[PDB]
């Protein structure tokens, strides 16, 4: 069984974000070839995406919830590093990130 907090990351945070209309670009690792993203892996050192986060939760990978939160922070920040303020993907990430913050502020205590 996962920690209370990791269950919350899976059943509240990921479940909510996955269903959001803007989440789909984040469902799998950025494929820099398919997306024609020059030098993506030269500038983004630690790729992350919500499909990987969801798999890590399903597959019992994390030891504690802060590791999962760090993966979300990496995912969002990578989007901002690579893209300029007016890009649609930045607006999409910003909406998801606000929800992420609102939800992790309500993370439960372990008991
Ligand atoms: N980190 C990044 C940067 C640019 C992107 N375009 N589309 C997706 Br999904 C992206 C993710």
Swiss-Prot record:
What clinical condition does the entry mention? A chromosomal aberration involving BRD3 is found in a rare, aggressive, and lethal carcinoma arising in midline organs of young people. Translocation t(15;9)(q14;q34) with NUTM1 which produces a BRD3-NUTM1 fusion protein.
Role, per record:
Chromatin reader that recognizes and binds acetylated histones, thereby controlling gene expression and remodeling chromatin structures. Recruits transcription factors and coactivators to target gene sites, and activates RNA polymerase II machinery for transcriptional elongation. In vitro, binds acetylated lysine residues on the N-terminus of histone H2A, H2B, H3 and H4.
Q: How does it assemble?
A: Interacts (via bromo domain 1) with GATA1 acetylated at 'Lys-312' and 'Lys-315'. Interacts (via bromo domain 1) with GATA2 acetylated on lysine residues. Interacts (via NET domain) with CHD4 (via KIKL motif). Interacts (via NET domain) with SMARCA4 (via KIKL motif). Interacts (via NET domain) with NSD3 (via KIKL motif). (Microbial infection) Interacts with the Integrase protein of Moloney murine leukemia virus (MLV).
Recorded superkingdom: Eukaryota
Please give the tissue specificity annotation from the record for this chain. Ubiquitous.
Where it sits in the cell: the answer is: Nucleus; Chromosome
Family listed: Belongs to the BET family.
Annotated spans, Acetylated histone H3 binding? 45-47
Query: What is recorded about the protein's domains?
Result: The Bromo domains specifically recognize and bind acetylated histones. The NET domain recognizes and binds the 'KIKL' motif found in chromatin proteins.
The organism encoding this protein is Homo sapiens
This chain belongs to which protein, by name?
Answer: Bromodomain-containing protein 3
Q: Which residues of the full protein are shown?
A: 34 to 144 of 726
Residue ranges occupied by any Bromo domain in the UniProt entry = 1-107
